[PDB]
């Protein structure tokens, strides 16, 4: 169901603009 | 005795299927290596394209 137990460590990164 | 000879045939099949799995393992690892080595070359084209941008 809802992935409430697993957390991966990443995203599609852009910092600040 | 028929039990023993069919045991031998089945162990032979274990050997052959293990041979095919061990033969595909190298191709899997090499494809990982090849996609990484090709992905570096596009990054070389990346930095060359900005170096020709200026």
């Amino acid at each position: 169901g809802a992935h409430t137990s697993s957390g991966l460590a990443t995203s599609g990164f852009r910092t600040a603009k | 005795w028929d039990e023993h000879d069919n045991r031998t045939r089945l162990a032979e099949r274990i050997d052959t299927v293990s041979r095919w799995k061990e033969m595909l393992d190298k191709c899997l690892t090499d494809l990982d290596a090849e996609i990484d080595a090709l992905a570096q070359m596009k990054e070389s084209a990346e930095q060359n394209l900005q170096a020709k941008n200026l």
Partner: protein
Amino acid sequence: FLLQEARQRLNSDHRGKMETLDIDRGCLSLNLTSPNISLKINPTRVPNGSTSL
């Protein structure tokens, strides 16, 4: 993209090889003594997937 295609086919084939090894080794380890020895419903049953050597 082509390298990704070939990687996916080889990964599926490798997983299939692991599955057939994992079931056939237990079939070899079956003895005269094991509990789950039984008369099955229909021996010499060729299934719907007949894929020769």
